[PDB]
């Protein structure tokens, strides 16, 4: 995309901590940038929309190349962050409102480095990543997500010279779902064969998808939470078409370059229904804030080893809370993501181990070694109504069959039109982000 001249781009300042030992950290003066999908797209030498509602203008965008020549994405000024997009920062806390009323629904954002010209790339192997979260106002059907993806640090600017904005304009998004709803891919409008998504007034799908590796630290609302590894072959940003995208709609979910299911550790799905929930007698009380700690263990305990284990623990009101465990007869009580856990649990659930097909923890680790961009988002799910996270999936499945039940939400929950009314004022908060060696962040 070209860059427009109507509004300066002003990312929100967000300090994080880089740590060397427990309680010995230094501030890193980073910032938050809005994903290019949420930006106004208009004519390069005017005010005329190139995209309105869920459609590209066919006169301006008869082809992707012409669209890209004629159109530009514009900046987010400071005033518009809260007023238009529902984003705000107080000290080291970042807040994202779900619906902001001209009416904005959801948000996806990235962490910029201290220069505000590149994404802050995190080399996560043999490191610990930690943050405080509040998901108390997110119920069934919503997801306040924090995760990493194998985006380029410059959003693709060096690879795709028609991308003028780079990381500064939140470009280059890709993930392990190979999404077609990304409006700008490889420096070009994804306007070919663009199709609105029914019941989604703001979104559509273009000819291409954009694939890359994804490490989900946090997919969650107050009812259920998960962390998940998604390797791809290769891991780096890859525009896809046809079978390579692994499109759900053509029966290709397991035929593409990315592991779409991922290998998940989701406490409720692993059959501990009392670990996490909205109340003081759950082990971890989702009505109150808490700290989420993630440790990425290698084979030799060094930065050069292969990724072998994703460990997790929590801190809430000064109380250390170890992760829940897998709880099925004849299955080891795993409390972390490893290749063995993935094989054993997917075996039990009858899920295809595409994680293993894509190179497993080792391949996931190669993405983490090269460095990944931090994503913070809030969203509802127009495909599957978040049932995969917090309900029975498939909805018609027996909840006593291992793998089906992922949370207590009813199978009628999560319809975007309903959650966008009922949960309009939901806000996820991510704060006090800390990064360092294992054992350094609490």
Automatic annotation (TrEMBL):
The keyword rRNA-binding does not apply. Its EC number is 3.2.1.91. Disulfide bonds join 19-25, 50-71, 61-67, 140-409, 174-212, 178-211, 232-258, 240-245, 263-342. Pfam families: Glyco_hydro_7. It catalyses: Hydrolysis of (1->4)-beta-D-glucosidic linkages in cellulose and cellotetraose, releasing cellobiose from the non-reducing ends of the chains. The keyword Signal applies. It is an enzyme of class 3 (hydrolase). Keywords: Carbohydrate metabolism, Cellulose degradation, Glycosidase, Hydrolase, Polysaccharide degradation, Pyrrolidone carboxylic acid, Signal. GO terms for biological process: cellulose catabolic process; glucan catabolic process. GO terms for molecular function: cellulose 1,4-beta-cellobiosidase activity. The modification Pyrrolidone carboxylic acid is found at residue 1. InterPro entries: ConA-like_dom_sf (IPR013320), Glyco_hydro_7 (IPR001722), Glyco_hydro_7_sf (IPR037019). Belongs to the glycosyl hydrolase 7 (cellulase C) family. This is cellulose 1,4-beta-cellobiosidase (non-reducing end). It comes from Daphnia pulex (Water flea).
